[PDB]
Ligand binder design. Structure first.
Ligand SMILES: NC(=O)c1ccc[n+]([C@@H]2O[C@H](COP(=O)([O-])OP(=O)(O)OC[C@H]3O[C@@H](n4cnc5c(N)ncnc54)[C@H](O)[C@@H]3O)[C@@H](O)[C@H]2O)c1
Ligand SMILES: NC(=O)c1ccc[n+]([C@@H]2O[C@H](COP(=O)([O-])OP(=O)(O)OC[C@H]3O[C@@H](n4cnc5c(N)ncnc54)[C@H](O)[C@@H]3O)[C@@H](O)[C@H]2O)c1
Ligand SMILES: NC(=O)c1ccc[n+]([C@@H]2O[C@H](COP(=O)([O-])OP(=O)(O)OC[C@H]3O[C@@H](n4cnc5c(N)ncnc54)[C@H](O)[C@@H]3O)[C@@H](O)[C@H]2O)c1
Ligand SMILES: NC(=O)c1ccc[n+]([C@@H]2O[C@H](COP(=O)([O-])OP(=O)(O)OC[C@H]3O[C@@H](n4cnc5c(N)ncnc54)[C@H](O)[C@@H]3O)[C@@H](O)[C@H]2O)c1
Ligand SMILES: Nc1ncnc2c1ncn2[C@@H]1O[C@H](CO)[C@@H](O)[C@H]1O
Ligand SMILES: [Cl-]
Ligand SMILES: [Cl-]
Ligand SMILES: [Cl-]
Ligand SMILES: [Cl-]
Ligand SMILES: [K+]
Ligand SMILES: [K+]
Ligand SMILES: [K+]
Ligand SMILES: [K+]
Ligand SMILES: [K+]
Lengths: 461, 461, 461, 461
């Protein structure tokens, strides 16, 4: 028997497999790569450490990497994001996976360690697929010898890419990386439209609250903030937006949102006097989207309207000051990943107290913690990029290069625009969309190939 | 007195001045530059040849350049885009302007020549401000000795920038340029939200048609196609989108549009048989947004539903095959810039014929031809960038540089992100928006200065 | 050889006729009635006094009544709503019309009198078609003997119907009326979707203001307030709604609007202290939609943000306290139907004053005053109802009935639902819509005829 | 030792009670009635048979009836609509409830019988609260002696009201009813906005499909069809609408939808040749909203695009021909209330077959079957009307009237507009909305009391 896994319930595997078969039909770009490359086995010999939300969508990614010849050892990059039926289906296929919904922090770290170690010794990994950079950091700090044999890292998300660029600037990055996030078929698909789909989904599953007619404050208006604001406005919320970037704030104004600060004149002096108590006393829902720290701070939480919902769809659990809430206020679990936080004091609560907030997913990614994250047809884009990135770095064989050649290739790069366009075309055909083919006269006129690429690398879409 | 101008009717000046005084109140970024720089006169000695739509918005731009010390000589860059009251108010302020709504092509060329020549001889021009590149082209082909003493070109629009980059690639560009278009406070403000405002405006003014419930086809989904599609969808049109760029097409799908081609399978076979007659036979409105040639071709025009409206909001009138319609079909003027084009033949029409198309602005930019183009508060972004670009190139004094130093500076560049952010901030304050200030701990965490810039140059917004 | 008219400029007739031929193609319900009834001449001997906005749409209505055998004498029901090309085309067809854009109030009354009198004596009128009730009131108060020969009144608008119902309650109504307004193909087409089309249109034509990102207050959330709110929100305005009717307020909340009052706690105590100065100080645009009096009162006008736009789209100009502004503040005409109202005093203003409001159409219906009112394809529904109402009351011949039979028929009634459905079907076919036919089994199951009507008279749609 | 109940799992009671305490804070109109009437106990002696979806919202309704003095015996009106935690919390409070999610049809009927009988014998019921009419029908057919002592029926839904009106027409209705559905704070709140909230919710929970960019067909455009169409369009679906009522079809056109029929020219001739195969071959999602029979028929199911989702949000499961699919096609359960229906035959299926449909909730109400139905703050309106209707009929004491007095009161009536307005006001205050108070002069001008009602009974909102 296969035993090299740890999942909540292996008996969920048949359900997981039914959902994987549906997901394949929703992921034409990823299934296109399976069909194109299966014969050629471009990841034969690849041994991939994977750390990304163990969802049905990640299951189709894993089985694509395996279909192209890879071996993998997998964990989730978040304690609440695993779909237990997806983890079970992957374990039942004989793939090492260590993931369940509702891990402790200690279990989270143990699951990553179970991917790194096989039978008590470092696995002979030669590739990394990461979401958020925790596995990347553990390899660099705790297993630096393993990075001598690793050809590359493919990084999913905005925050993970920031961490790679910090290592590259400091000369501590040991292997090259592909920034998957900044493909247009990732950043301007997943980060925006994924949150559009999944933020209102997660709030409805957690609370079943009406959103129409209520007041929201979205902190941030990057790709996640844009999609989150639309998720709420399209339901009929009155959405206000906070930003530190005046260009993003300009976009929020033109998109029909009022731009406000939680702080008087936008200045946080650290005192309660700097809080716009009148603004926050009218807010029914706060959503953090920044990838920054303490953007929904203790003084903001004290000033929020009674019975406001608080949630985070960006970075870790520290966009909201959940540590302040754990120390000072009394938590009542409604159901998993839904807590009433009683502002009456730190110990006991009255079941009928009216002065509480509702926190979703303990301040962790709400779309994955309270629903199922982005849908298959959106993750198709992200995960087709991940597969292309794995193929590219594995074929370059960085770990085998002489030192002089390594020095030239030690970088954090995006995939070429031609590949971003090829992913997009498969996504468009999935919708039954028909792209026009330029005439040679038209291609000459605008200075492009009929085949593309269609835009210069400066183009922002 | 002052006679160095040609406008439709100088008696419109008082009306134009009333509208300029309103427009100043809608343009805080541009009036902020007036207030900041008036004392230091950074354009003292600047002699600007201007060629851009002679609107009220352009009037505030002209008067800002003059307030900062510049002398100008102005023309419109389109035969239909002048607002006669704007042209009159500028002439009445003693500024040379040669512009009226409804120029012939011969008059258009004569107006540009009247900016270039003062009293029959080259003007001592030392700067160019252009929209679409026609003035730039005339100087390069016909007045090369004038370009010897010109420090730079500031170019407004996507098509004009493409023409500059073609000259730079061929080594024929004689002076450096700033690509004003690709400021985020231009491309992702004017090109998108301006067309959102002004496309449905122009269609209503020209036709007074109900848009709700009718079928539109928007050709292109770049910045202008995105804003145009929203202009129509927000009115309740059923909008279909055509694209050659699969990434733009993916955006159109995720934005909730069906992506279609006028050609079967997207392929033009050179014949009528390749036209999707069933699709085009249901379309009430076609809008071209591409900057490309013949994207609404003769065979598409033959297949359109009876009484369909045809218009173009890209920079030039060759997106639609209007030459085909001039040669083959009978034009009936409804009113200025609105023609019924009778598909019954060239030599006369029945006044009650049902088989016609309605063409707006004879296929020229419809927002400016049938309405007033973008609103002041949007043009504020574009024109604040134009003023900063004029200051930057004028201060660099390229014409005065020795040959070896010119070679290092001969480029087509965008303004630095810090300036794009400073324009955006004044636009946000104009809406009463309040940007948040990062704390020192937050700025250190995300790796930015508290003052900005907030994003790397790769960021796409 | 026709002089029985007064219009601004008869030379506009050819332009008017071109626009009437376009409008016929946009009005299938009205042109369906022309085709169906032309043979029967059901209005042969009808002599209709008409008083409704002299637009292109009203032109097609007039020519339908004439095609079915009627003679008419026509005036506009508003001093600013005439389209001079429409009035000219009607005069040029030999129809008596007394209407021009920009009448004085004295000219307005003179125009209605020229319809009532032919060659200095009362016309032998036998039908009335009214919008707002002014002609109805003049006949009752000043020409009661003419009402002895009149078979009925067909009334277009909410306020005119209210005036009829007041006469009927008081026993002063002399002839029966049809309430055209309350057909679903009028009230829930024209009043709502017409204002959706034409409010943003009129504001853009008058001011060319950007609406996106700015704050609006819509007073009222009936059919006009619902359409007006959507006109603004779809442009990206942040819309707040005021209401006195809690059911309409509930709809505004669920539609995604914040419901506010100009008055603290919704109580107007007549003092400045009762004004919510903080709310009105943030408003860029106020729109009145109520059909009520003084809903934008002197204290609200004093408190509005500098440079706010003020307009009314309800039937009469006393929704806004324009009398207060005429007595106290200095009016600056920007252009026709656009005034800056300087809150600095009565007897002069600084041309560069910042403390003004912008009033559109001097507080009269803004959609008709600053644009062209509702589009042809919407007015098709209203005007097909008007024609059916004229045919129905003319055929009943009330004036010829004995007193006992008159008493049974003296009422204000709506058209039967079957006729409302027949108008709707022609409107749907105009969009290329395909209505499904019930099977006999389905019709039996839901208890309707396959031909309709499909809904009980209580149904609200 | 209370045992007079049957629920899935009594240990879910604590979770249900936490959700009821949250729901109370979202239901101000219902909690307002508790506060107002608790002292007076207007339902003291009331013995209510309730048959409505056993949700958290129904829990707050039940506990309001009990707080006002009623005893109840409860069942669900649908096999899949119970929330097991709500049923457990009501059982744990000592209230007889017979309800669980996933009843068989035999269990459904047994649950209704357990409300009717206490200890084997008719309960001393004197009131009925019904949703859909099944309990009403069972009492009329099987328990006529019980209806002798019943004062009235309060009926929730459109289909149930139709069944009452059919009994009233036939003289078979034994007790008077209130049509709760046709309160504006029910029909134009619940039926529309509830489905707006809950349709996309249920589709996401069942399938996790992306909706953006996909094609939907909504059958019907009444209140449910309007809310359903918005649920999908706001997610970015391309929505087409089918209707038999041309007035509802006109609304769909003006709302920006294409109106289509499954049948060529809208004629179902019963043959496959009448199916618009090209239309149905492009549809990803069909939603039935009609309250009619066989509106998504066998020939339509055969023609649908592979892997289309099929669901019903009308009251009963015969809108879709699920009988045809049970007889002809192989059902694969994905998870509860989600089936793949393999069009390859009845016998088995290939696990990787591509030719299937996805049916949600076995064709039963999808919002309640696959999600939690409408949110608390919407059901507040419906259920405040239910409580007022119960109070009204209970106070009238119809069963105690002599035969001659019964004959005068045997009707199906709506609540008076004043009560509809009082429910709306509490709903508006729940959003923080501020209704304006008319001045005496304004109230006199529009002919209403300052307290309301504000509209005539003919008003359609
Ligand atoms: N939950 C998911 O499914 C999902 C999807 C994509 C990415 N992410 C995560 O979302 C986060 C944001 O990613 P993104 O792609 O939108 O990044 P981004 O850089 O596009 O946007 C972040 C925005 O936050 C703003 N911001 C920073 N500090 C702020 C503050 N104090 N107040 C207000 N605004 C502030 C920045 O100006 C910026 O515009 C990251 O942590 C990323 O990894 C999550
Ligand atoms: N009217 C105005 O006020 C206004 C404002 C800004 C720019 N412009 C002009 O509008 C044009 C477009 O500018 P932009 O900034 O949107 O450029 P862009 O590069 O952002 O977009 C143009 C798009 O057209 C698409 N396209 C090209 N050929 C096509 C074809 N045959 N079929 C369909 N799609 C096709 C391209 O793929 C691209 O996405 C330019 O000519 C620009 O100068 C006009
Ligand atoms: N083309 C046009 O401009 C056009 C079109 C149709 C109707 N009308 C006119 O528009 C007006 C409104 O018509 P409607 O059909 O919407 O009527 P309606 O009865 O549907 O709505 C009017 C609304 O005003 C609200 N209201 C009244 N007094 C108020 C106050 N003090 N503050 C806030 N709200 C208040 C009422 O509660 C009501 O809901 C009428 O005068 C009608 O004749 C104009
Ligand atoms: N799921 C829920 O939570 C919920 C909510 C309220 C009502 N309901 C139920 O939804 C159903 C509809 O209710 P409603 O209030 O919208 O009713 P309605 O009368 O407002 O609308 C039903 C519509 O269906 C149309 N229709 C009938 N036959 C048709 C056909 N063959 N093709 C196309 N359209 C057709 C009718 O013309 C009508 O406009 C009822 O069964 C009602 O009880 C369910
Ligand atoms: N109101 C206006 N005034 C001047 N330029 C305009 C206006 N509206 C649009 N444009 C410009 O026209 C250019 C196309 O020629 C666009 O790049 C845009 O910046
Ligand atoms: Cl070619
Ligand atoms: Cl390129
Ligand atoms: Cl005159
Ligand atoms: Cl003419
Ligand atoms: K998912
Ligand atoms: K303009
Ligand atoms: K004066
Ligand atoms: K019009
Ligand atoms: K619910």
């Amino acid at each position: 028997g296969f035993t090299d896994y740890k999942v909540a319930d292996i008996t969920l595997a048949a359900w997981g497999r039914r959902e994987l078969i549906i997901a394949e039909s929703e992921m034409p770009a990823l299934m296109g790569l399976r069909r194109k490359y299966a014969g050629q086995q471009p990841l034969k010999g690849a041994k991939i450490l994977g750390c990304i939300h163990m969802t049905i969508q990640t299951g189709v990614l894993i089985e694509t990497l395996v279909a192209l010849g890879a071996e993998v050892r997998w964990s989730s990059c978040n304690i609440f994001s695993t779909q237990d039926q997806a983890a079970a289906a992957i374990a039942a296929a004989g793939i090492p996976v260590f993931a369940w919904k509702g891990e402790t922090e200690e279990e989270y770290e143990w699951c990553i360690e179970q991917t790194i170690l096989k039978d008590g010794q470092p696995w002979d990994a030669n590739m990394v697929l990461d979401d958020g950079g925790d596995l990347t950091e553990i390899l660099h700090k705790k297993y630096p010898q393993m990075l001598e044999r690793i050809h590359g890292i493919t990084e999913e998300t905005t925050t993970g890419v920031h961490r790679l660029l910090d290592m590259l600037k400091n000369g501590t990055l040991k292997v090259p990386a592909i920034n998957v996030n900044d493909s247009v078929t990732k950043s301007k698909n997943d980060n925006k439209y994924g949150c559009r789909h999944s933020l209102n989904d997660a709030i409805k599953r957690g609370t079943d609250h009406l959103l129409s007619g209520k007041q929201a404050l979205v902190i941030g208006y990057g790709d996640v903030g844009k999609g989150s604001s639309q998720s709420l406005r399209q339901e009929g919320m009155i959405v206000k937006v906070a930003e530190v970037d005046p260009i993003c704030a300009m976009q929020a104004c033109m998109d029909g949102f009022e731009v406000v600060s939680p702080y008087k004149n936008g200045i946080n002096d650290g005192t309660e006097a700097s809080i716009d108590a009148a603004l926050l006393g009218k807010i029914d829902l706060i959503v953090t989207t920044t990838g920054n720290v303490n953007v929904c701070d203790a003084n903001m939480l004290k000033a929020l309207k009674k019975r406001a919902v608080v949630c985070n769809i960006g970075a870790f659990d520290n966009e909201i000051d959940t540590a302040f809430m754990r120390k000072n206020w009394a938590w009542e679990e409604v159901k998993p990943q839904v807590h009433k936080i009683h502002r009456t004091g730190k110990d006991g609560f009255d079941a009928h107290n009216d002065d509480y907030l509702i926190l979703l997913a303990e301040g962790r990614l709400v779309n994955l913690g309270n629903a199922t994250g982005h849908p298959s047809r959106i993750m198709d884009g992200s995960f087709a990029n991940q597969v292309l990135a794995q193929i590219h770095l594995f074929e370059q064989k960085y770990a085998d290069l002489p030192a002089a050649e390594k020095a030239k290739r030690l970088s954090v790069e995006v995939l070429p625009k031609k590949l971003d366009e090829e992913v997009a075309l498969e996504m468009v055909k999935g919708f039954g969309g028909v792209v026009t083919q330029l005439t040679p006269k038209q291609a000459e006129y605008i200075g492009v190939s009929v085949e593309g690429p269609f835009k210069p690398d400066t183009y922002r879409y």
